[PDB]
Amino acid sequence: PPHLAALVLARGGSKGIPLKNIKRLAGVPLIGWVLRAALDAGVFQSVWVSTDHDEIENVAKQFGAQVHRRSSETSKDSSTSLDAIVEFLNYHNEVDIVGNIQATSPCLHPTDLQKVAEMIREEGYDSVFSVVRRHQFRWSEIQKGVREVTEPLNLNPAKRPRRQDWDGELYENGSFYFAKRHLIEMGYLQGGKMAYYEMRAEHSVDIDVDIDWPIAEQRVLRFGYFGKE
Amino acid sequence: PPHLAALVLARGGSKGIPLKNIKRLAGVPLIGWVLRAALDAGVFQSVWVSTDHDEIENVAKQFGAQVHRRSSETSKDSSTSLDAIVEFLNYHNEVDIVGNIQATSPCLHPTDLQKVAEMIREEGYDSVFSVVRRHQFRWSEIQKGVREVTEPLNLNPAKRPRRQDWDGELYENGSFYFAKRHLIEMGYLQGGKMAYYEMRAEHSVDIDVDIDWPIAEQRVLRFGYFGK
Numbered sequence A: 001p002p003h004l005a006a007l008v009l010a011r012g013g014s015k016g017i018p019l020k021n022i023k024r025l026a027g028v029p030l031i032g033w034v035l036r037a038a039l040d041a042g043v044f045q046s047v048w049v050s051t052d053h054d055e056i057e058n059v060a061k062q063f064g065a066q067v068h069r070r071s072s073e074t075s076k077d078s079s080t081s082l083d084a085i086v087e088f089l090n091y092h093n094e095v096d097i098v099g100n101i102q103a104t105s106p107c108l109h110p111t112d113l114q115k116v117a118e119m120i121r122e123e124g125y126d127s128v129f130s131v132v133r134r135h136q137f138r139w140s141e142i143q144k145g146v147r148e149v150t151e152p153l154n155l156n157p158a159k160r161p162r163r164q165d166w167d168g169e170l171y172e173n174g175s176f177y178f179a180k181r182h183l184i185e186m187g188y189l190q191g192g193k194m195a196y197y198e199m200r201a202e203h204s205v206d207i208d209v210d211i212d213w214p215i216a217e218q219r220v221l222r223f224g225y226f227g228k229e
Numbered sequence B: 001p002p003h004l005a006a007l008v009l010a011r012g013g014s015k016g017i018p019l020k021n022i023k024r025l026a027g028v029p030l031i032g033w034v035l036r037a038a039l040d041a042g043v044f045q046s047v048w049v050s051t052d053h054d055e056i057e058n059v060a061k062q063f064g065a066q067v068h069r070r071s072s073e074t075s076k077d078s079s080t081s082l083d084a085i086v087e088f089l090n091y092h093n094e095v096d097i098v099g100n101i102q103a104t105s106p107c108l109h110p111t112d113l114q115k116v117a118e119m120i121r122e123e124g125y126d127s128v129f130s131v132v133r134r135h136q137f138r139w140s141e142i143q144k145g146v147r148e149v150t151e152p153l154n155l156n157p158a159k160r161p162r163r164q165d166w167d168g169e170l171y172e173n174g175s176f177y178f179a180k181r182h183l184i185e186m187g188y189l190q191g192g193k194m195a196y197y198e199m200r201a202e203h204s205v206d207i208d209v210d211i212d213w214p215i216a217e218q219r220v221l222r223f224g225y226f227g228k
């Protein structure tokens, strides 16, 4: 069967706090959360970590992840996830399907990764990515050259609905992006027979979105996977 | 000057565990946070709290907020804000502008309330509510059975933008809704010369959003307004 490789891109020069990817969150360096759920899923043929730093390589290896080294060319704030993902495949042909997991979503559980693997295995999906449901109203933005005018992009102001009165909308949460080789090797992170996977809001809060690291630590300790019971 | 009243709707029933509006958050009952920011703004001719419960009325008074005892019909799980704000005005024809503030966003600061108040002066707006910027890609949900597919409504999967490549989108954050009497009376919280007020992300996390109440506790401590 195909080769499902978990891939976690972890550069050294992060935003604000440098070497953020191995910073301890709840006593465990970041990449460790996601790598653990990855391996415990027992669904991948290989769990990788693409980095450019010696310390990230070490931590990765401590968590039983294979490591792929690269330069910082795909580690720039102008670089893209597809950039570094191709950089990787261009070295491992055995890899048929890439499960790109982001360390900035430490509350991932193996259960979700197992069901996505099954969506691809069973319903022959080409690409699958994590999504989250939200119930927040959207309003235009005063265009350039001003004019001043907002319009309800969602609701009808005459009748504002309660949150339990309407499905919300679906937004990617950044957790994971699964895609076949032929797709990534074409420029699409998502495409072909596409599907999303709705995860629980408790697992969707991004590290950079919580803002504060400790509030984030409070979060992972309350909703994260700590390994096998 | 036009009468600007702060109005915090706080009913006893909270879908789930009741009195959530009076439940201590970081050592102070929820409505206290918003009330404090309101009073310290020094921009309201009155700061009110509409409730249907005694306990909430007391706490409200302790924070130096006037209290309006609401009718049961506007205190229901189904009762919309407009119904409640409209039931309040029925007893205060002295109010010209209603500053509807939600207790469920305790990281409010008086600075934001003062700037919105001023927006209503110079720009002369009929309605101004709080909003927040987010950069999240939206996707169509599957329905109508069959092998239905999800579609992008926000971006182009072939070319996905970067944070810099584009400006996010504006979502209401639930913080506050300012509206003139004539708008409210005609059943609109947002209408006439409409404007939004973009607030900082750190001050836009709703209670229901964090889920874990304690998480909100650490949030108000690190990002709330502690009076003084």
Ligand SMILES: CC(=O)N[C@H]1[C@H]([C@H](O)[C@H](O)CO)O[C@](OP(=O)(O)OC[C@H]2O[C@@H](n3ccc(N)nc3=O)[C@H](O)[C@@H]2O)(C(=O)O)C[C@@H]1O
Pocket: A135, A136, A137, A160, A161, A162, A163, A164, B009, B010, B011, B013, B021, B074, B075, B076, B079, B080, B081, B083, B084, B102, B103, B104, B172, B173, B174, B175, B177, B189, B208
């Ligand atoms: C102005 C408005 O429409 N506020 C509604 C907000 C708003 O849509 C979000 O904040 C923005 O995403 O959503 C709701 O939010 P929620 O139910 O938590 O209510 C906000 C606070 O207002 C009080 N309230 C509201 C109406 C009413 N008749 N009496 C009240 O006492 C509550 O006690 C609560 O603490 C929701 O659907 O869950 C219902 C709220 O009424």
